[PDB]
């Protein structure tokens, strides 16, 4: 089979820079017989370039496809925030039709601190004997973030589940949710719950908490 390779999982760029997204085929696919697709978050893929270098209808020429044989490049000159997407190559020289694993284009923006919110378990969940404490860390940049949970001041690690959004095409930020799931049995016996975040923008960790002797 023809193996299609994209060496870069992630490429990060500020608006205005030149980005080169590369693709390698394991065998000569010629002309073209190489296609580029663009997949924006919350969308299905769209055809971007075909025959290595021909732009599809609606694609601006700040997008340039080049190469032949085994080495291909999609250049986005003067990249815009609009271009936030995953980019995949595909060969159509022979069967099976094969794809690269994609390169995600991250749009650099000014550093942004997360807005952190913590939520006690709902009374409804507690009635069924479970207690999930939820922490949202929304609209931050850059993407790297670490969350620690504490219960009455002591760090808790088991029962923590994290999930991340992709970069938002509207403000170029990330968001993350962290959920600490305990039994109600255990939840009942403690008063203080704390979500603690460390980020590029933090010095001391960002601390969000609640005590239970309350509303």
């Amino acid at each position: 089979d023809i193996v299609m390779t994209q060496s870069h999982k992630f490429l990060s760029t500020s608006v205005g820079n030149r980005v080169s997204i590369t693709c390698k085929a394991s065998q000569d696919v010629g002309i073209g017989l190489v296609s580029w697709y663009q997949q924006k978050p919350g969308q299905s893929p769209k055809l971007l370039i075909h025959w290595a270098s021909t732009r599809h209808t609606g694609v601006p020429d700040r997008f340039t496809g080049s190469g032949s044989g085994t080495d291909f490049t999609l250049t986005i000159n003067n990249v815009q925030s609009e271009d936030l997407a995953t980019y995949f190559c595909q060969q159509f020289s022979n069967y099976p039709l094969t794809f690269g694993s994609g390169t995600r284009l991250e749009i650099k923006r000014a550093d942004a601190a997360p807005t952190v919110s913590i939520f006690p378990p709902s009374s409804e969940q507690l009635t069924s004997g479970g207690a999930s404490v939820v922490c949202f860390l929304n609209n931050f940049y850059p993407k790297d973030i670490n969350v620690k949970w504490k219960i009455d001041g002591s760090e808790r690690q088991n029962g923590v589940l994290n999930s991340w959004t992709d970069q938002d095409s509207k403000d170029s930020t990330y968001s993350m949710s962290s959920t600490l799931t305990l039994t109600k049995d255990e939840y009942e016996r403690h008063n203080s719950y704390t979500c603690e975040a460390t980020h590029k923008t933090s010095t001391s960790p960002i601390v969000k908490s609640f005590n239970r002797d309350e509303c």
């Binding site: 296609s35 697709y37 299905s44 893929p45 769209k46 055809l47 075909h50 599809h56 995949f88 595909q90 159509f92 069967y95 099976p96 039709l97 094969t98 794809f99 690269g100 694993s101 994609g102 807005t115 919110s117 913590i118 939520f119 006690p120 378990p121 709902s122 409804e124 969940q125 069924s128 479970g130 999930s132 939820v134 949202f136 929304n138 589940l161 994290n162 999930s163 991340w164 959004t165 968001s175 993350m176 949710s177 959920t179 609640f210 309350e214 509303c215």
Partner: protein, 219 residues
């Protein structure tokens, strides 16, 4: 405009069978080759099957002898009949249209297929109201915890779609053979709790369509 609408997604047990369908609109169906491409967790796009405008047929090696692609041009419909399904078959399935070479110039919305012996389970939907200190900043963030459902997907909207700015819905995490998802919405603090905020959750696999109001607690 060109439309490709996939159907038949859902949950099937290992060794089972399933038929996906795709209804095409907006072009002369018989002028175009059609294909299935899937995207499975942890993997990039993976081409599965192709059929010519009238009949020439190609399969990925991984599905040969198990899957059958067919089309009915009188009904503008593409089919993928799947047999002896395995866990590895779990993926989003896109129906795609070619031009005159095997370049897919149009992709459908995608249908989600899950192969597993776990049973269909409706989600429990929990309202997440903030504690006292987290109200009456300029903004307030509310949440919705969608817990213990199977299989994917679930859809979440806020106030039937009205609030969509300020929403973050997080990818599901599969734990305990069950999915858990969360969603937040951030509104002006003048808005809630003076007006009602509701998260609406649909789980088509279990015929669940739940509306959960976010109520502030009592002191």
């Amino acid at each position: 405009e060109v439309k490709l609408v996939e159907s038949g997604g859902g949950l099937v047990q290992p060794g089972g069978s399933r038929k996906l369908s795709c209804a095409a609109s907006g072009f002369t169906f018989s002028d175009y080759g059609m294909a299935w491409v899937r995207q499975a967790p942890g993997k990039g796009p993976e081409w599965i099957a192709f059929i010519s405008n009238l009949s020439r047929i190609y399969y990925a090696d991984t599905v040969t002898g198990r899957f059958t692609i067919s089309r009915e041009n009188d009904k503008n419909t593409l089919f993928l009949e799947m047999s002896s399904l395995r866990s590895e078959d779990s993926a989003i399935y896109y129906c795609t249209r070619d031009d005159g070479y095997y370049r897919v110039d149009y992709w459908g919305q995608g249908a989600t297929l899950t192969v597993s012996s776990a049973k269909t389970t409706p989600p429990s939907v929990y309202p997440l109201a903030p504690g006292s200190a987290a109200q009456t900043n300029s903004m307030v963030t509310l949440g919705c915890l969608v817990k213990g459902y199977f299989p994917e997907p679930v859809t979440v909207t806020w106030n039937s779609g009205s609030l969509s700015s300020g929403v973050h819905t997080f990818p599901a995490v599969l734990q305990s053979d069950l999915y858990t998802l969360s969603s937040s919405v951030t509104v002006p603090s003048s808005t809630w709790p003076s007006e009602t905020v509701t998260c609406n959750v649909a789980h088509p696999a279990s015929s669940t369509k739940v509306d959960k109001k976010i109520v502030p607690r009592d002191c």
